[PDB]
Amino acid sequence: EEIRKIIPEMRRVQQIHFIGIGGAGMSGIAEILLNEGYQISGSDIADGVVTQRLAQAGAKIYIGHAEEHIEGASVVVVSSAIKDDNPELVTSKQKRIPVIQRAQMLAEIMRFRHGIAVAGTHGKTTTTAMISMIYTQAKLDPTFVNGGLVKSAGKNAHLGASRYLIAEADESDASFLHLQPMVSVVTNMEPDHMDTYEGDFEKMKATYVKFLHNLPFYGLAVMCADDPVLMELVPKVGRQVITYGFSEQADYRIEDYEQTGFQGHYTVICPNNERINVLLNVPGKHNALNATAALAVAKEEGIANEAILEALADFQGAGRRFDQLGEFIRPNGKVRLVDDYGHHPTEVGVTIKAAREGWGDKRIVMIFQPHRYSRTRDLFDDFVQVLSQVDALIMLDVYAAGEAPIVGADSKSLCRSIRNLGKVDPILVSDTSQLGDVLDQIIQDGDLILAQGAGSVSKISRGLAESWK
Amino acid sequence: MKHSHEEIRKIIPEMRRVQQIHFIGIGGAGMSGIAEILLNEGYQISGSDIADGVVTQRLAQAGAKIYIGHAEEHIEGASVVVVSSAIKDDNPELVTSKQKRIPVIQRAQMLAEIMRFRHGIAVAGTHGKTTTTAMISMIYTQAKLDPTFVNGGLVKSAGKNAHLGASRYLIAEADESDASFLHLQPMVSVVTNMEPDDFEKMKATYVKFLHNLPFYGLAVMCADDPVLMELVPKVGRQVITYGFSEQADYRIEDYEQTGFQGHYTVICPNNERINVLLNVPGKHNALNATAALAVAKEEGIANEAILEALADFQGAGRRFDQLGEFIRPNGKVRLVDDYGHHPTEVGVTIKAAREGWGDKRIVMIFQPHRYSRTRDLFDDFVQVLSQVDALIMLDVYAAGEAPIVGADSKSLCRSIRNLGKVDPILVSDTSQLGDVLDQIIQDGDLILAQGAGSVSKISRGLAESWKN
Numbered sequence: 037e038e039i040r041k042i043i044p045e046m047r048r049v050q051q052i053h054f055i056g057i058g059g060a061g062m063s064g065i066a067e068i069l070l071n072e073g074y075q076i077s078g079s080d081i082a083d084g085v086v087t088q089r090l091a092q093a094g095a096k097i098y099i100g101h102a103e104e105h106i107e108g109a110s111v112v113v114v115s116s117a118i119k120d121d122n123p124e125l126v127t128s129k130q131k132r133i134p135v136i137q138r139a140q141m142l143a144e145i146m147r148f149r150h151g152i153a154v155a156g157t158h159g160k161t162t163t164t165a166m167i168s169m170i171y172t173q174a175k176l177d178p179t180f181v182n183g184g185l186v187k188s189a190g191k192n193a194h195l196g197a198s199r200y201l202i203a204e205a206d207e208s209d210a211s212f213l214h215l216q217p218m219v220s221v222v223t224n225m226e227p228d229h230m231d232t233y234e235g236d237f238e239k240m241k242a243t244y245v246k247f248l249h250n251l252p253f254y255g256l257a258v259m260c261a262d263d264p265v266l267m268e269l270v271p272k273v274g275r276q277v278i279t280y281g282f283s284e285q286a287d288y289r290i291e292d293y294e295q296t297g298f299q300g301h302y303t304v305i306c307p308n309n310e311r312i313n314v315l316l317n318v319p320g321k322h323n324a325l326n327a328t329a330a331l332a333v334a335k336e337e338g339i340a341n342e343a344i345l346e347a348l349a350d351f352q353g354a355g356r357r358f359d360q361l362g363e364f365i366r367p368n369g370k371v372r373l374v375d376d377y378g379h380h381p382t383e384v385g386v387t388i389k390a391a392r393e394g395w396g397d398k399r400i401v402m403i404f405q406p407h408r409y410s411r412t413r414d415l416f417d418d419f420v421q422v423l424s425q426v427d428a429l430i431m432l433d434v435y436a437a438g439e440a441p442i443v444g445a446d447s448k449s450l451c452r453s454i455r456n457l458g459k460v461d462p463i464l465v466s467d468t469s470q471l472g473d474v475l476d477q478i479i480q481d482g483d484l485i486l487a488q489g490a491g492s493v494s495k496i497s498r499g500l501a502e503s504w505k
Numbered sequence: 506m507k508h509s510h511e512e513i514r515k516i517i518p519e520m521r522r523v524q525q526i527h528f529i530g531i532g533g534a535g536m537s538g539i540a541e542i543l544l545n546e547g548y549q550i551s552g553s554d555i556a557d558g559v560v561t562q563r564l565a566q567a568g569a570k571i572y573i574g575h576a577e578e579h580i581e582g583a584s585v586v587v588v589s590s591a592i593k594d595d596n597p598e599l600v601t602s603k604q605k606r607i608p609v610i611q612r613a614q615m616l617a618e619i620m621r622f623r624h625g626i627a628v629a630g631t632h633g634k635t636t637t638t639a640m641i642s643m644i645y646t647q648a649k650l651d652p653t654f655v656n657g658g659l660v661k662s663a664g665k666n667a668h669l670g671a672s673r674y675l676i677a678e679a680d681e682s683d684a685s686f687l688h689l690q691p692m693v694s695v696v697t698n699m700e701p702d703d704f705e706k707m708k709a710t711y712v713k714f715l716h717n718l719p720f721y722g723l724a725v726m727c728a729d730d731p732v733l734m735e736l737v738p739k740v741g742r743q744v745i746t747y748g749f750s751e752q753a754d755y756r757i758e759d760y761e762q763t764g765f766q767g768h769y770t771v772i773c774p775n776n777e778r779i780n781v782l783l784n785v786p787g788k789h790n791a792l793n794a795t796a797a798l799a800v801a802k803e804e805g806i807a808n809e810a811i812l813e814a815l816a817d818f819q820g821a822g823r824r825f826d827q828l829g830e831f832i833r834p835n836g837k838v839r840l841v842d843d844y845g846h847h848p849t850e851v852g853v854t855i856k857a858a859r860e861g862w863g864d865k866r867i868v869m870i871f872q873p874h875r876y877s878r879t880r881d882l883f884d885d886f887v888q889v890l891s892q893v894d895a896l897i898m899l900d901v902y903a904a905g906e907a908p909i910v911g912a913d914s915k916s917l918c919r920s921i922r923n924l925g926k927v928d929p930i931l932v933s934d935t936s937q938l939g940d941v942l943d944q945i946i947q948d949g950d951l952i953l954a955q956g957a958g959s960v961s962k963i964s965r966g967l968a969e970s971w972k973n
């Protein structure tokens with residue numbers, strides 16, 4: 037093989053089986069290994085768009101779990117969600133077949149590659165997408181594995197013939213400590229409650245320091261200068277650190293930012309005082325940060341300005357990140373529908389701000405679906421404050437993602453709390469078939485409607501668009 | 506750019522912005538080899554040593570900038586500094602390196618970086634590492650795979666302890682000392698044996714080492730070592746075993762030594778029978794050679810390349826190393842240098858010598874290495890040294906350490922004398938070694954110069970003198 041001329045095959049691995057292949061992060065890795073020539077099989081509790089598109093591709097997909105699904109596997113990859121009583125997990129274990137976590141299989145894909153890893157609380161998929169598009173435009177034909185669809189490629193993952201790997205690195209459960217990258221980005225590290233001691237936050241800080249310590253002596257850490265937690269960690273990294281951001285002390289410093297429409301314009305001053313005027317095809321200061329992490333990696337690796345500026349000027353985004361669905365003429369006015377993945381209050385907040393800066397004096401209307409009861413409970417007051425910043429609000433019920441309900445942490449509670457704040461009067465919509473009709477009555481001409489959240493909400497907005505189309 | 510550098514760069518990437526690599530203590534063994542691979546890969550190399558020498562002149566001629574005495578100015582432009590573990594904080598080069606914030610890494614970590622993007626085969630265990638590493642490197646070379654290798658001893662056929670090859674393969678000795686082997690990330694790991702000298706901690710370190718293998722990696726372990734076999738369920742990776750044991754994956758049967766060559770059959774896991782001629786003596790070498798055969802077979806190498814390399818195998822330097830035959834006034838003798846320094850190592854060497862020497866005598870010149878080791882394994886030394894026909898004792902080779910009452914050569918000689926099997930001669934002034942030997946020699950004696958210290962240098966000077 038042409039890829040084998042670069043990447044060696046794993047000893048005796050003929051078939052890789054994925055238990056929970058529709059789970060987060062699973063499909064992307066499966067795609068790379070399928071394209072490298074391995075036989076791939078996988079199972080999932082539900083049918084869906086991920087699971088069905090891997091089948092087109094050549095993998096055998098099974099709905100439901102049964103021990104016979106593991107027939108012939110050389111190794112089994114399990115998602116975070118899998119429980120000890122999984123008939124396939126149990127059987128694998130008996131046949132004495134190696135069982136690995138998803139981050140471990142990613143590390144093996146990174147092993148003989150030049151890995152560029154992207155981690156942090158917020159912006160990982162976006163930054164990963166931007167780096168991947170720069171490397172692509174520079175003609176470096178990178179492999180990438182992202183936690184969202186890269187729109188220009190039509191996939192969340194792609195196998196390239198070079199040695200480059202661009203990959204999103206998930207800190208959850210220290211997953212990422214098996215990764216051995218050449219360059220590591222950390223976009224930010226945001227505590228749930230900044231003025232209160234939280235043991236899980238300090239532990240998480242310690243895990244990011246260990247992650248950076250996986251860089252070789254000659255490796256590079258790229259960190260946001262505008263995040264005080266990251267800047268405090270600097271002296272403990274012990275590898276070269278390059279910073280980026282609006283801070284006067286940033287190595288790659290952003291100046292003169294403005295947003296026009298949904299595009300950003302700004303200048304980056306490099307460490308040697310080179311000036312780069314950037315046009316970025318997605319909105320908000322938070323995207324200029326993400327794109328500057330990407331420009332900093334590219335410049336540090338010697339990539340030319342032309343390919344960097346072309347990729348950012350034409351950047352189409354990751355799927356669901358401020359993803360414009362179209363304009364729709366309704367009886368009560370012409371409206372613009374946009375999907376956004378933001379699920380944490382900070383992410384929802386940055387999204388609203390970027391919407392506002394491109395939308396003059398027309399209204400912002402949001403359809404919000406909280407993701408998980410646990411996070412809704414943990415940051416409840418912050419969700420109340422941020423959701424009160426829109427002009428009109430429809431709440432959908434919590435997307436459980438597998439969790440058991442928690443009293444006082446559901447949409448009905450969020451709704452009541454927002455109403456009491458009195459900045460906006462929300463409408464709860466528990467029957468989504470009724471969603472279009474409900475919007476129809478509250479809508480006004482020129483409204484920009486944000487379909488917001490990380491769960492099924494984008495499938496819901498999808499239907500709505502089609503029916504209005 | 507030279508063709509060789511271009512071809513290597515298509516497989517192995519250059520390390521980011523690393524232009525010059527400086528070695529503090531570059532004449533040390535363990536240092537010069539890694540330094541010469543990096544030189545041959547295209548990096549600028551500089552280094553320092555308190556003493557000038559062959560090595561240092563060797564390096565210096567190849568293109569390395571070498572200096573004697575440690576000195577802050579020696580660090581000029583270094584991108585990274587490599588240090589042995591022996592170094593001290595007062596070291597001028599070390600203190601300024603840290604002050605100029607130039608990364609400072611240990612030898613094993615530089616070895617790990619050479620392994621990072623290669624297909625590493627790592628050789629660990631208490632005894633037989635340098636030998637097994639040399640045998641695997643000779644097989645891979647004979648198979649036209651052009652390996653890179655880093656060994657703790659001279660590979661005689663290649664004339665070097667280390668060599669850069671143009672392929673992806675790396676064969677490397679892995680040292681358990683202070684967990685240094687934990688930095689390595691190999692594809693295949695050999696463990697020859699594990700013998701004490703605390704122990705449960707050493708066991709756990711080896712298990713941790715083997716966990717560094719990828720999920721698909723291979724552990725190759727000696728089936729004849731009960732401690733290794735006890736650890737098998739803790740490994741968590743595929744294990745292939747080798748040895749005389751009935752249950753070995755690669756089983757040795759029908760072994761007989763003829764002269765200084767071994768003859769035996771290896772039976773492979775699918776029952777394939779392979780008849781081996783091994784150009785070095787002793788069952789212990791048949792074990793090391795079968796670790797080597799198993800690795801090669803598991804990697805798909807043809808029988809002919811394995812057999813050819815083993816039939817012409819020349820040994821590692823100082824491992825049952827034949828220095829030739831000499832006619833002395835009272836007899837024609839054969840002189841052999843051996844590095845064995847632990848009682849078990851001395852014991853297998855004596856055995857291999859007996860198996861090749863018929864009814865003639867074995868005379869040994871033994872130099873104990875370290876006072877601490879002598880103290881710790883004293884009784885075992887006394888038993889094993891008692892198995893020769895004539896024994897000359899040199900004084901302990903200190904290697905750093907202060908004398909310990911009761912653990913010196915005089916004490917050893919006394920206890921051996923008291924056992925009544927051999928009556929040893931202590932030779933404190935080595936300028937008289939030749940004359941003492943000439944007075945005890947008989948026609949046909951094999952003389953084994955035995956130990957890990959200066960004994961090898963001493964034996965070769967005796968040889969040169971006897972040559973002229």
Ligand SMILES: Nc1ncnc2c1ncn2[C@@H]1O[C@H](COP(=O)(O)OP(=O)(O)CP(=O)(O)O)[C@@H](O)[C@H]1O
Binds near residue numbers: 325326356387
């Ligand atoms: N640097 C940044 N700082 C804060 N919020 C950001 C951000 N970049 C993006 N966001 C917001 O977060 C949402 C998700 O962006 P993105 O997918 O790139 O981040 P991420 O991958 O870290 C999400 P997750 O942690 O769920 O994987 C965006 O739609 C936007 O709401």
Ligand SMILES: Nc1ncnc2c1ncn2[C@@H]1O[C@H](COP(=O)(O)OP(=O)(O)CP(=O)(O)O)[C@@H](O)[C@H]1O
Binds near residue numbers: 630633698790846
């Ligand atoms: N499998 C084995 N088992 C026991 N003794 C062995 C052995 N292989 C070699 N020896 C003996 O040990 C001596 C040194 O062999 P070698 O250099 O290969 O091992 P090693 O590299 O593990 C020594 P060190 O631990 O000092 O590095 C030989 O000269 C012989 O005395």
Ligand SMILES: [Mg+2]
Binds near residue numbers: 160
């Ligand atoms: Mg993501």
Ligand SMILES: [Mg+2]
Binds near residue numbers: 634635657658678
């Ligand atoms: Mg050795």
